């Protein structure tokens, strides 16, 4: 509840960061950020399970 | 970076979720969220490096 506003910003933000992952010219940076955003989605699902 | 304003809000948000971990009632959820927020902090500092 107290975090519904913050998740309201957070979820499009994760979408934008995973979308910006494709735009990195560097291949290592693109691979790391793409894997990190995949991990971040599962993490944030678990985090809001814990908060809820 | 079109994420500069985002991170200015993202890191205080991570702090608030770390503080809210302490007020969870199941102790295992408290431990799990605390550890999660620590990692979230380190990981988003990295992601902010990859976006620059
Ligand atoms: C990634 C992210 C970006 C945010 N960006 C903004 C923003 O640009 N403007 C804003 O007012 N709140 C933003 N927020 C929400 C703030 O963290 C916070 O909920 C808001 O300032 C309301 O504060 P209050 O609870 O004291 O009213 C963002 C949250 C996150 C997680």
XYZ file of C-alpha atoms and ligand atoms in Angstrom:
135
model
C 0.000 0.000 0.000
C 2.534 2.606 1.163
C 4.543 1.554 -1.856
C 1.859 1.571 -4.571
C 3.038 4.976 -5.803
C 6.644 3.841 -5.868
C 5.866 0.640 -7.731
C 3.784 2.811 -10.052
C 7.001 4.507 -11.022
C 9.196 1.427 -10.692
C 7.620 -0.899 -13.206
C 7.778 1.427 -16.283
C 11.270 2.302 -15.117
C 12.316 -1.363 -15.305
C 10.677 -1.512 -18.753
C 12.681 1.527 -19.866
C 15.987 0.161 -18.503
C 15.508 -3.248 -20.134
C 14.627 -1.393 -23.365
C 17.715 0.823 -23.101
C 19.795 -2.365 -22.680
C 19.400 -2.964 -26.446
C 20.703 0.530 -27.215
C 24.204 0.128 -25.729
C 26.861 0.042 -28.435
C 29.187 -1.995 -26.197
C 28.431 -5.733 -26.430
C 29.606 -6.565 -22.905
C 27.537 -3.750 -21.376
C 24.498 -4.835 -23.408
C 24.886 -8.490 -22.281
C 25.376 -7.559 -18.620
C 22.472 -5.132 -18.471
C 20.165 -7.535 -20.347
C 20.928 -10.362 -17.887
C 20.624 -7.949 -14.953
C 17.183 -6.730 -16.038
C 15.981 -10.329 -16.456
C 17.161 -10.967 -12.872
C 15.626 -7.721 -11.685
C 12.139 -8.730 -12.843
C 12.134 -11.900 -10.720
C 13.682 -10.018 -7.797
C 11.029 -7.296 -7.868
C 8.259 -9.914 -8.084
C 9.702 -11.510 -4.916
C 10.219 -8.154 -3.182
C 6.639 -7.090 -3.600
C 5.507 -10.590 -2.574
C 7.449 -10.011 0.678
C 6.042 -6.507 1.164
C 2.516 -7.736 0.409
C 21.059 9.855 -19.412
C 17.261 9.942 -19.387
C 17.560 8.002 -16.133
C 19.193 10.729 -14.017
C 15.890 11.812 -12.414
C 14.910 8.171 -12.064
C 17.958 7.223 -10.020
C 17.534 10.320 -7.868
C 14.188 8.807 -6.839
C 15.181 5.134 -7.120
C 17.857 5.056 -4.414
C 15.709 6.717 -1.650
C 12.993 4.220 -2.614
C 15.410 1.302 -2.080
C 16.217 2.809 1.323
C 12.536 2.984 2.284
C 12.001 -0.672 1.326
C 15.050 -1.643 3.412
C 13.574 0.238 6.367
C 10.183 -1.347 5.827
C 11.774 -4.806 5.905
C 12.216 -4.402 9.707
C 8.453 -3.969 10.220
C 7.574 -7.280 8.551
C 6.137 -9.808 11.012
C 7.480 -13.175 9.714
C 11.138 -13.069 10.698
C 12.263 -15.046 7.641
C 10.565 -12.496 5.363
C 12.393 -9.773 7.323
C 15.755 -11.443 6.696
C 14.965 -12.140 3.048
C 13.845 -8.608 2.235
C 16.809 -7.088 4.119
C 19.343 -9.134 2.144
C 17.413 -8.371 -1.059
C 17.550 -4.617 -0.463
C 21.314 -4.699 0.195
C 21.840 -6.469 -3.143
C 19.366 -4.171 -4.893
C 21.467 -1.210 -3.802
C 24.717 -2.706 -5.111
C 23.087 -3.884 -8.341
C 21.409 -0.579 -9.170
C 24.725 1.251 -8.575
C 26.177 -1.112 -11.195
C 23.227 -0.620 -13.587
C 23.703 3.138 -13.241
C 27.334 2.566 -14.294
C 26.217 0.513 -17.331
C 23.767 3.221 -18.416
C 26.309 6.066 -18.338
C 12.194 4.982 -10.287
C 11.306 5.981 -9.595
C 11.136 7.236 -10.126
C 10.316 8.190 -9.502
N 10.193 9.420 -10.088
C 9.430 10.294 -9.489
C 9.280 11.564 -10.060
O 9.836 11.889 -11.095
N 8.477 12.464 -9.413
C 7.836 12.157 -8.263
O 7.139 13.033 -7.761
N 7.946 10.952 -7.686
C 8.710 10.057 -8.268
N 8.850 8.809 -7.704
C 8.129 8.499 -6.458
C 8.863 8.965 -5.225
O 9.770 7.964 -4.805
C 7.870 9.268 -4.101
O 6.959 8.186 -3.984
C 7.089 10.566 -4.313
O 7.989 11.674 -4.277
C 5.998 10.769 -3.287
O 6.561 11.167 -2.009
P 5.577 11.306 -0.734
O 5.214 9.891 -0.338
O 6.373 12.029 0.332
O 4.381 12.105 -1.213
C 9.657 7.850 -8.305
C 9.837 6.565 -7.772
C 10.646 5.640 -8.394
C 10.820 4.270 -7.794
